Design a protein around this nucleic acid. Structure first.
Lengths: 262, 73, 124, 180
RNA sequence: CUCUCGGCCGAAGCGUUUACUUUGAAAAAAUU
RNA sequence: UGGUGACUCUAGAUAACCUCGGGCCGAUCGCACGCCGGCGGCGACGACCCAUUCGAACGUCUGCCCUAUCAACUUUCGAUGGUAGUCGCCGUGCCUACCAUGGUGACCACGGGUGACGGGGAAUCAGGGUUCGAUUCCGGAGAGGGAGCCUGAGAAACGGCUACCACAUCCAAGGAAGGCAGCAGGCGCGCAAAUUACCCACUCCCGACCCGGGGAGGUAGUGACGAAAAAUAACAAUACAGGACUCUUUCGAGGCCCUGUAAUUGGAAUGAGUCCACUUUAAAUCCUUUAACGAGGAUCCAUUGGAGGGCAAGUCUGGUGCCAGCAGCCGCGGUAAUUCCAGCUCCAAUAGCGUAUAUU
RNA sequence: UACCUGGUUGAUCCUGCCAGUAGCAUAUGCUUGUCUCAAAGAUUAAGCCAUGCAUGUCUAAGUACGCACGGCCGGUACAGUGAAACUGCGAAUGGCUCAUUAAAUCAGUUAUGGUUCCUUUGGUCGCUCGUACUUGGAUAACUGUGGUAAUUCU
């Protein structure tokens, strides 16, 4: 390539979008944003495929230009604008609020939230540096750089941010005995308490996490995201409680469902 | 190729011009004429035999005058 | 008489000012129903005027009973005008497409590229 | 690059020995039993059964308490009971291997039509299906190789539009009745 | 297998080092 | 102060410097207009630098086909390393100077070949493997051949320019214009491959931007590459023919199913078609849906191969007479030809089936 | 479906090949009623190319004095829509091909503490002690004058 690519094909598109195979040749290339294109929902896919509000791209556009959609309390007119993890989508005309939280299976679930909860979101800190006349800066996974934070806050910690101000409120520190979710990899979308973190210098730090049903699993530290102080989460949790069901048990559940409602 | 419009006929002319020529073996080794205009100058009208004036293009080989000429029919 | 309209996945788009629905049409004896009739029927079901509703994409099943289409009932005619794809507005005579082919207008464009200034308006 | 799917399978394997009397005669017999168009229908059935047996084989090699063996096996048994080839008592993985070609040809629509007294012959049944006289539940079925499931078998009818079913006589009857 | 610092435990070292096996996280979709 | 596994890191203080081919420190626009003469609320363009995203670009580790009728190769012009530098966005023989004499090699270096772009994959297959991967996804490379540029964040760009070589159009004889390995289409090449069609309706992208544009893309057309489904008839009464159940010493006699011939009938059932309409659709077409017409065998007629053996099916009939020919191989033909050309009959596959080639 | 059959001899058992058999690829022959999908100038010539077309673009928001327009009410600086042209941006994507290229590309893996990065997204943008209730010079589009056989020439 001579420069940067602007196109993305439907086949090369990330799987967790749940795109078709025959509708078109091109997937909607996510605009450069606060989230990496591999692990984000574009507004179009969320609006027309998840919620079905719109049928076509034109219809999606006709909503985004009427200025109804607010992502993190700010009106975005771009249809391909990437909304990622812990991201608050607000439509005021219908009076409906959604938060993008990963499903048990590893996809973006349509998770409805109360307007009280829609006022805040959570942020993992990616880096802390001190720059220009002794001013420390947090840099979160949502690219949000916050000047003058708490000196107690270190890397890999989760902060609660009120969206109206853009300022931090209170934080959960990364420690053994805290509730987590996975943001990337094989165990994506699974929730549990941190068991034990082990350090490897010059490599990724493997973190062990125990489930609600006793299923211990591990991940990389870049993929872990703290949520709860002890056991109780700071946000609402999807219909599937984060505990990954095995296939057989899922089948059983399905059967039960079939039986109950006839 | 269909013939309905002058645009369709133009496509046809173009096709007839740029075409792989099947070289017919008999024509190539001899020298021939098609007649564009024919004039008759009788030596004697009572004889009913005279001089012919076949004007057209030579197409085969180089036409030599010493050689005989055959009119088809 | 023997025509029956049923409405399946029904949803109100308040962000589009319409009522979006799936339509099942039962017509056991006859052919596929003309759109006008179905529009009328839907109107009479949903109390509204037939002028505002649009139906599209009716595919009859093999055998010959069910027909499944999509229909949307807008709130106002103005909203319908503002939100609907323009070819579906042309099926009710609300929109008119230009009679020129693509090729012609490409040619014109390419002509007018070549000349500078006001002379772009003269060449056609 | 286009938005088209190039996925497709061949749904039969042609035999290694093209002329062996045992095989030819056997297949002929099968054909005669279940009224089929050519050898290729039989071969299709054979291929499907073979696939099933492969699936069942590649599961038995795994441990009895291996999850894959359990889940997949259960699925397969469910699928083979739901068509009506196996029995609920004999719903164990080993019994799958002891299936025959004819047991899948029995669950064909044609054969069902023949058995259920809608037709008088197998060919007659086939023709009845083709002409669009036979419906399943409410759906008119034109295809005769349509494999009838166990639950769906209890209502195979004569389709309201057909002369045998509801009414309205066909073309020949119309023609003859309008002579004088 | 263990003395050192902290809350019977976690850090500190390991253990001659591999080869081997098992497990764990990563290994783009489509295809299979 | 703060941070890594580790900084010559970030941040702090001091002395200075700061390019004129110069670095920031808004001489910009739109919307509603309102408050103690003076102050203001949203939004658009901006902007040095931080972050972030999209990336790119350089490295590490391990992983390729054939060849020894390629055994030594690399270093005068950088080969391997050191130091200092130049250049470069940065790390480095990347270049220059000065030093050292290294580096690679039968664990196959170097050289040569490849009917070699690399992967993801495909075909075949018990297990192992063998072969293919120009082809729609990722990465790479080039736009006739080489080379050098401008602008730009990003290009050594070719639907940019500049040369030379090779081609090649218009010329008023002075000059000017080129680049289909984009979509059509043509020539040529060949064993070998589609229309100068319609449309931005979807999928998406670009744009100051809900509005414009897009031979990206979609839709048709051509299409027996290949894959899926699937008609070419079914039934009844007769007349035979079998095979059965009951009764008769047996012969037989009955009403029990099944089978073809029907040079016998008989009406029913249908699609192919023909064809209003609807639907589909950007507009259409197709399919689906449906009015009417549409089936008796001289039709709405099924083909390609074969019939000695391999290998399923004729010592049938005529013709030919080691001729013509057939035959993958074994062989057939020289006057009774089961093998040739025909006729008839039969078999295999069946809307497909032969033949040549690559390969498993 | 972990499969073999004919052919060396007076006959036999062998080694052993040739031939058969089945797929899968391209071509091709004859044949072809319906219907759903569907490859398709790669192989040889990365050979040459008539013609048409494939990258252009405007909002409430950079610059309107084109009567180009119906049109305000008239000294109302600019009502509005708006051809053009300046500017900004895009054209480095996409599409096509497979000629080169053999640890080269590429893949998995790791680094950038050794660099750059349009735009988006977030931060920052009276932190400098030293005519502004508004600066200068042009140049298009326009009018008019032309040149050349001719160009997206000037």
């Amino acid at each position: 390539a001579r420069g940067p690519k602007k196109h993305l094909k439907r086949v090369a598109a990330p799987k967790h979008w749940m795109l078709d195979k025959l509708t078109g040749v091109f997937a909607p290339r996510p605009s450069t944003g606060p989230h990496k294109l591999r692990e984000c929902l574009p507004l179009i896919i969320f609006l027309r495929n998840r919620l079905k509000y719109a049928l076509t791209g034109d219809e999606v556009k006709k909503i985004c230009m009427q200025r109804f959609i607010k992502i993190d309390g700010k009106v975005r007119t771009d249809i391909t604008y990437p909304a990622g993890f812990m991201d608050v989508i607000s439509i005021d005309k219908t009076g409906e609020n959604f938060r993008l939280i990963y499903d048990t299976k590893g996809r973006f679930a349509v998770h409805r939230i109360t307007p009280e909860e829609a006022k805040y979101k959570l942020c993992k800190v990616r880096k802390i540096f001190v720059g220009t006349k002794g001013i420390p800066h947090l840099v979160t996974h949502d690219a949000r750089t916050i000047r003058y934070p708490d000196p107690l806050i270190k890397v890999n910690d989760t902060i609660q941010i009120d969206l109206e101000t853009g300022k931090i409120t209170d934080f959960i520190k990364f420690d053994t005995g805290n509730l987590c979710m996975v943001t990337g990899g094989a165990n994506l979308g699974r929730i549990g308490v941190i068991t034990n973190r082990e350090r490897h210098p010059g490599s990724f730090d493997v973190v062990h996490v125990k489930d609600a049903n006793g299923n211990s699993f591990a991940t990389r530290l870049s993929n872990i995201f703290v949520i709860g102080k002890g056991n109780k989460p700071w946000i609402s949790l999807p219909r599937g409680k984060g505990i990954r069901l095995t296939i057989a048990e899922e089948r059983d559940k399905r059967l039960a469902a079939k039986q109950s409602s006839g | 190729l269909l013939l309905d419009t002058q645009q369709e006929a133009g496509m046809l002319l173009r096709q007839l011009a740029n075409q792989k020529q099947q070289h017919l073996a008999f024509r190539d080794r001899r020298a021939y004429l098609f007649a564009h205009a024919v004039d008759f100058v009788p030596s004697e009208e009572n004889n009913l035999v005279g001089t012919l004036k076949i004007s057209g293009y030579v197409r085969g080989q180089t036409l030599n005058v010493n050689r005989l000429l055959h009119i088809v029919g | 008489d023997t025509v029956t309209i049923r409405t399946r996945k029904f949803m109100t788009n308040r962000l589009l000012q319409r009522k979006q629905m799936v339509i099942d049409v039962l017509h056991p004896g006859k052919a596929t129903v003309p759109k006008t009739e179905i529009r009328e029927k839907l109107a009479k079901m949903y109390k509204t005027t037939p002028d505002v509703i649009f139906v599209f994409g009716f595919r009859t099943h093999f055998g010959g009973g069910k027909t499944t289409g999509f229909g949307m009932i807008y709130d106002s005619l103005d909203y319908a005008k503002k939100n609907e794809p323009k070819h579906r507005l042309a099926r009710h005579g609300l929109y008119e497409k230009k009679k020129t082919s693509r090729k012609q207008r490409k040619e014109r464009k390419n002509r007018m590229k070549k000349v500078r200034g006001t002379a772009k308006a003269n060449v056609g | 690059p286009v938005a088209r799917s190039w996925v497709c399978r061949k749904t039969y394997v042609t035999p290694r020995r093209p002329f062996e009397k045992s095989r030819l005669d056997q297949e002929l017999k099968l054909i005669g039993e279940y009224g089929l168009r050519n050898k290729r229908e039989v071969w299709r059935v054979k291929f499907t059964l073979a696939k099933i047996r492969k699936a069942a084989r590649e599961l038995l090699t795994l441990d009895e308490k291996d999850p894959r063996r359990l889940f997949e096996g259960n699925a397969l048994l469910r699928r083979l009971v739901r068509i009506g080839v196996l029995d609920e008592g004999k719903m164990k993985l080993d019994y799958i291997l002891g299936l025959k070609i004819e047991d899948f040809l029995e669950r064909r629509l044609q054969t069902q039509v023949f058995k259920l007294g809608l037709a008088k012959s197998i060919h007659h049944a086939r023709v009845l299906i083709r002409q669009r006289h036979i419906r399943v539940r409410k759906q008119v079925v034109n295809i005769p190789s349509f494999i009838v499931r166990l639950d769906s078998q209890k209502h195979i009818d004569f389709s309201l539009r057909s002369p045998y079913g509801g009414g309205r006589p066909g073309r020949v009857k119309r023609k003859n009745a309008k002579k004088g």
